[PDB]
């Protein structure tokens, strides 16, 4: 598959709808996210494409290689690590994204996963307790959606 | 992924959770649907994992093979022709399903892809008209899901 999307649904008011395309040798990730607060939310490929218990079910980041978490500009990091995305004043966050570890195809398809937008910042990894090393501190998940095929 | 898990919703009151397996070169498919009207109700795997427009997003019937729409047990069947499942007068389906055409890994994997459930039963191919071997008469499409990776 050379595209794929994903609709974040949740308990509150955020939803979205996220866009993925391989291209070159790369993966293209775009799209926007409402309803959230003003500033920076983690932004993450789960490992599961569970949503039997909500969000929850989706499990941790999706984790191949054995690494602890990290920003996406890491060589340590998850390969699920998008690191942030930021919303503005009116709770709109633009997502530009471009990973180099995440593919639509193999061993680092993210293809029926789980993409799932925090409910605060990312520490990429730097918080110093065990839990930074894990999820960066990002806390709830506010929507998630299992990442689809797409036409 | 030898486990899959789809989670159906729609506008309706219509709700369920599948659970799919591999064994052999089949995909054992288990779960229940609530909320549906006693009778039967077809059930299809639709080839894109698209819920950016509910259900219709979704596309056609999974036919990488292109083939016509059938039951089943047909020879000339979709992949993605999963027949009906069948409501009892509480609107609760059981599902229970072991099929030889679905995959849950190569080419033709349902991963990624939207499982669907019908408003009315699906005739597989026989009930004579031209909207019979393209969907069998299911009808509206009342929840569907996006099939994960399951742990
Ligand atoms: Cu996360
Ligand atoms: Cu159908
Ligand atoms: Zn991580
Ligand atoms: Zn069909």
């Known amino acids: 598959a050379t595209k794929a999307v994903c609709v974040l ?3 509150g008011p955020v939803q979205g709808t996220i866009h993925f395309e391989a291209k070159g040798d790369t993966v293209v990730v775009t799209g926007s996210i409402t309803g959230l ?9 789960h490992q599961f494409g569970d949503n039997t218990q909500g969000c929850t079910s989706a499990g941790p980041h999706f984790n191949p290689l054995s690494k602890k978490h990290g920003g996406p500009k890491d060589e ?3 390969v699920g690590d998008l690191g942030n995305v930021t919303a503005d004043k009116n709770g709109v966050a633009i997502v530009d994204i471009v990973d180099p570890l995440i593919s639509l ?6 293809i029926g996963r789980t993409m799932v937008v925090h409910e605060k910042p990312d520490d990429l990894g730097r918080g110093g307790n065990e839990e930074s090393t894990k999820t960066g501190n990002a806390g709830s ?3 998630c959606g299992v990442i689809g095929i797409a036409k």
Chains 1, 2 share one sequence.
């Open 141 to 143: 998940r506010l929507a």
């Open 105 to 110: 195809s193999g061993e680092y398809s993210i």
């Open 37 to 45: 607060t003003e500033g920076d939310h983690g932004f993450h490929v």
């Open 76 to 78: 340590e990091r998850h």
């Open 9 to 11: 649904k949740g308990d």
